[PDB]
Amino acid sequence: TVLATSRLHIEGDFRGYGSLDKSPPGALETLNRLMQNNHDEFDMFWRPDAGHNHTAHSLLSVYALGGSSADLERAYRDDDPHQVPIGAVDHSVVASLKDPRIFIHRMQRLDQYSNYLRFFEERIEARGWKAVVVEYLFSRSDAAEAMLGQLFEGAYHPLIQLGFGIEFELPGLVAEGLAHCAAHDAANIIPFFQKAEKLAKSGSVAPAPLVELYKEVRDTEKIRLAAKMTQGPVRVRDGVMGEAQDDIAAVAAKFQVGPDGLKQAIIETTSCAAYSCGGAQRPGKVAKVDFFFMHMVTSSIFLSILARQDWLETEDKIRLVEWKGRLDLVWYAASSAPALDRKWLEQYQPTLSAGMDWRALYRAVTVEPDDGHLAKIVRSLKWAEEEAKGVETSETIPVAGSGWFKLAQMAYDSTAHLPIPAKWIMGAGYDFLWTRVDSL
Amino acid sequence: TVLATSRLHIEGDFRGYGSLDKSPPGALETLNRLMQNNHDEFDMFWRPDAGHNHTAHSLLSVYALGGSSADLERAYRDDDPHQVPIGAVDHSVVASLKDPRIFIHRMQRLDQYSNYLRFFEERIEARGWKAVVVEYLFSRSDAAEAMLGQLFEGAYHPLIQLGFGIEFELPGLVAEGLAHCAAHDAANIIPFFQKAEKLAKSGSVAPAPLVELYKEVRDTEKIRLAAKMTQGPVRVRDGVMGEAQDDIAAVAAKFQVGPDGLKQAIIETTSCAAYSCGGAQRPGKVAKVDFFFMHMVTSSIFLSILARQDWLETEDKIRLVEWKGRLDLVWYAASSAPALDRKWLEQYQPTLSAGMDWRALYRAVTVEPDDGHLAKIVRSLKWAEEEAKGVETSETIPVAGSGWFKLAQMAYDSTAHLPIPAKWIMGAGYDFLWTRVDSL
Ligand SMILES: [Fe+3]
Ligand SMILES: [Fe+3]
Asked: CA B156 to CA B296: how far, in whole Å?
């Protein structure tokens, strides 16, 4: 049967966190048609590693930046490579997924995306999307505890997918997010999360500022050297988790958020992510932003949005932010824990984006051929400026004030007018990748 | 200890199977400098899947086709993406590999390439390359039986690497091929080879022509549908082998070469591979050659070269051709066992290569931006024409005579002037991939 949940219809004036100009007339009709087409026709995964379908991210991010119909059609066409036929649904499997032991058994298999999508659309039709998200992520059932680790997989793509669904209150996009979460292949991060949380809750680990834990990752050779450059998309599974899981779990346990610390922890994790992006530069080289660090920033807006949900308990919001900052240490390790310095972003002189304000940068981004990452990082940074309003740089907050926009300018300047493979550096700590980057 | 084996130096006038025009003066000096740089500086593997370094293949194929110094420099620059720093050697690991248990225990790990390379350069320094190849591939030890399955891994890359070292009698390149063979990640093909051979030698399985075995693979839904499109580089491991290993082993067991049948089996396996490339076209679509089928043809020249080695028993040459023809069914299944028809190559009208002969096509290939696959497929097809001279098309030989050059023209026409990702179709049996191909 046709589910009401399957129809993705955005209506009303809500146009995204970090929005400035409203999209001109016609854009919402185009967004609705393309979002529905993508929902119905395309899989979540188009290849076995780094294969996340970004179509919904690119569309909603371009809409939030005030893009027109033509800018949404551009976003959609730029992500043609991400768009492959959705897998056939087995309705027998969908019925069996209501059994939580079968639900757990079938997780972490990419080919199950469409089965979990039909399952979550059916559950959301019956119970409403808020009730289903609480049940399957926050209820502390065996299934929800697995799902919560899965939510951070693949450099935060399930958190992003679910985040957009929550942000726009789109029940069928919430279903995509939960199905993405269930089906994502495992990087062996669940035991890292369990180990670090068990140490953090023991009473025996003193909390430390996140910026000091990045330094501990770089300064601990066994963690720093765990990932290998040519492990590429499996640096986390085969390197950081395979060689140094216990070691990095002991570092991550020191990131602890007190019951009044939610807003400050979102600012701290977002600031340290931005610091990684801006600060991992090399003398004599043009500015480049690390692909993985960019994901630490693009995902950060969804922590701010989750933090504002009235159907979610403060203790769950705090747990999300703790796990996110802990996994940011893992992605930092996976880029070979590059030296960070605040001077790079402080001293950066914008090129293509010089003299622009946010409105002008937003408009430049809406037309730039891209898979959605430029629109996502620029929006997360505009939003970070709002979240962190009145917070200045300090020993624990490495980026703030003018730094949020300066990083958005750097991201634009270092990616615009390049083919997608030249845009982002695929691990800033690996000396060899800088031999392929332009000298000043 | 500097080894004599680590020096790669081609001298004399041997310029490769299928060679026509001699390279002009300066080419040999350029080849020797680039071959040595690649041998010394670069790993065999630049990413975890489909990450084979083709530099040696591209240089030696362009040289065989009569390329100039500038054609060799282009081939080398075009394979810059394949060229990443060689892994550090652990000399204590190299000493331990003398123990057959430790040798076997460390196999199938990409990161051990440089450790196996040093090991094989040391063994070849002591015993000569022929004795080391017999010991580690053909001696029937536990290690050699494992190595022999590994030789066909990753669509025949270890076989190609070793084949060029044997072809040019380059001890250091033979070392490259054995080390590639040892280190290559496993696709669970070793048990396929074991199950198919056991059935073939049981006396319970009547032999059948290879063309009927391609047909049986397509006509058996369990085998044809085992691989999924979005499994990409792991279709064999996670699809054909994961779902249908026993089923396809039973089909492959029917390919059986009699004691005088070596030359006919090389022609039959090469003709069926060429038929896959030429024959898997679609109505209303421009011609495109399947990437994996192309490997089934590029590797074929090395079966012919191995067949002419006086140090290798006839039984071992026959065993190579049986295993290769059997794994060709697995690669056909991995591309979703497309319908083949002899009309496409018979009716094909050359476009860019219209009116060229072999010498003009060779010259056109030497200058074409490419990673080495075009040079390799055109050389294999010129050689196939010599191997199969006087053999006409039949019920069991689907491609012959003018078909070899016609397919070479099709490969040039369908790849020239395109960026690398657009050159070859990544699984001709998947209908969806043809929606991205140009209409006639
Ligand atoms: Fe992404
Ligand atoms: Fe290849």
From this structure: 8
Own/partner long-range contacts of B159-162 (Cβ < 8 Å, ≥24 apart): B159/B299, B159/B302, B159/B324, B160/B57, B160/B298, B160/B299, B160/B302, B160/B376, B161/B44, B161/B52, B161/B56, B161/B57, B162/B133, B162/B302
Query: How far does CA B130 lie from the centroid of its chain?
Result: 21
Closest CA to B276 of B323, B344, B324, B224: B344
Alpha helices (H) in A308-424, listed in sequence order? 314-334, 343-347, 358-367, 373-387, 403-415, 420-423
Spatial separation of the C-alpha atoms in residues B423 and A105, rounded to whole Å: 40
DSSP notation for B131-156:
HHHIIIIIS-SHHHHHHHHHTTHHHH
Query: Angle B362-B21-B166 (CA atoms, 0-180°, nearest 5)?
Result: 85
Strand runs labelled E in A161-282: none
Phi then psi dihedrals of residue A42, to 5 deg? -120, 145
Instruction: Give contacts of A46 with chain B, Cβ < 8 Å.
Output: 230
A51 contacts on B by Cβ (under 8 Å): 230, 232
Give the separation between CA B295 and CA B274, rounded to whole angstroms.
Answer: 10
Determined by: X-ray
Rounded to whole angstroms, the Cα distance separating B363 from B66 reads 7
Query: Among candidates A317, A179, A191, A303, which has minimal Cα distance to A248?
Result: A191
Q: Is B113 on the interface with A (CB under 8 A)?
A: no
Per DSSP, the three-state class of B74 is: helix
CA-CA distance, B88 to A16, in Å (whole number)? 49
DSSP 8-state symbol, A134 = I
Q: Given its phi and psi angles, is residue A70 left (phi above 0), alpha (psi -120 to 50 degrees) or beta?
A: alpha
- Please report the residues numbered 63 through 82 in chain A whose beta carbons come closer than 8 angstroms to any beta carbon of chain B: none
Nearest to A85 among B48, B85, B432 (CB): B432
3-state secondary structure of B45: strand
Question: Left if phi > 0, otherwise alpha if psi is -120 to 50, otherwise beta: which for B347?
Answer: alpha
